[PDB]
């Protein structure tokens with residue numbers, strides 16, 4: 208029965224391949240660029256414990272995907288293998304490349320992306336915009352917030368040590384697990400070979416130009432230093448509990464303003480020290496920004512000294 212055999216040579220890796228009859232597909236987790244992502248229960252994911260079920264996220268390839276799309280999803284899966292596992296990244300768990308459509312299985316983070324996780328925990332009052340959630344959750348302590356930043360910085364320190372550049376580090380690309388662990392998504396994506404549209408929103412309405420370092424805006428240069436710039440924007444997102452960068456600023460104006468030295472103002476509830484860290488990440492000169500190793504050390508100290516009261 209050649210019915211439904213792929214015309215392509217999809218790479219079977221015995222360490223990672225899972226029979227798809229071990230997956231019980233559940234609710235949707237949203238549209239990715241390559242296709243749906245769906246929650247599933249995987250049976251015997253760990254060969255040590257074959258009778259146990261694990262919740263996982265299954266990245267699928269849409270039926271009308273192109274060959275570039277297929278190649279990009281394979282490239283991300285292979286890059287995840289080379290980068291290796293870390294607590295603060297979305298890890299590869301397995302793949303289904305035989306006997307049906309391509310599935311790439313990655314970790315499930317039940318609380319969803321960090322922007323909406325923080326927005327649902329906004330308290331009332333003057334320091335934050337309103338809470339948009341119809342299921343609002345308990346507010347985080349100051350220490351929790353700095354610990355969110357620390358965990359993302361630790362994940363980025365790991366990725367940079369593996370020579371992985373993220374290129375779109377933003378609160379919407381951080382997921383939060385049931386145990387409130389921060390996990391960076393999309394670090395393994397292959398870079399587009401075509402020029403980008405600065406004015407095209409993501410499927411979730413975001414304008415990624417607002418996280419771009421000026422050398423990426425102006426000259427399309429991305430380094431670990433430009434990821435540190437983005438991390439500064441992510442810091443501002445954290446201390447506004449999910450705010451939208453550059454409020455009121457039209458995107459066509461952003462490079463002119465940045466070039467003239469405009470930077471976002473300090474959020475109302477943010478220490479001078481954390482605002483200085485944000486501003487250091489936004490140094491005009493890439494060589495003068497802190498490294499992720501340095502951000503990790505400083506945030507570790509700040510977490511220790513920040514009240515959870």
Ligand SMILES: *CCC(=O)Nc1ccc2c(-c3c[nH]c4ncc(-c5cnn(CCN6CCOCC6)c5)nc34)cn(C)c2c1
Pocket residue numbers: 236237238239240241244264297313314315316317318319320382392393396
């Ligand atoms: C092209 C790049 C791309 O498509 N990237 C991409 C990467 C990962 C994911 C996911 C994904 C992976 N792992 C996940 N775990 C959980 C979730 C998730 C989605 N919604 N929720 C629930 C949020 N609610 C909020 C209200 O209270 C209950 C929880 C969890 N998503 C995960 C998903 N997608 C689309 C991509 C794309």
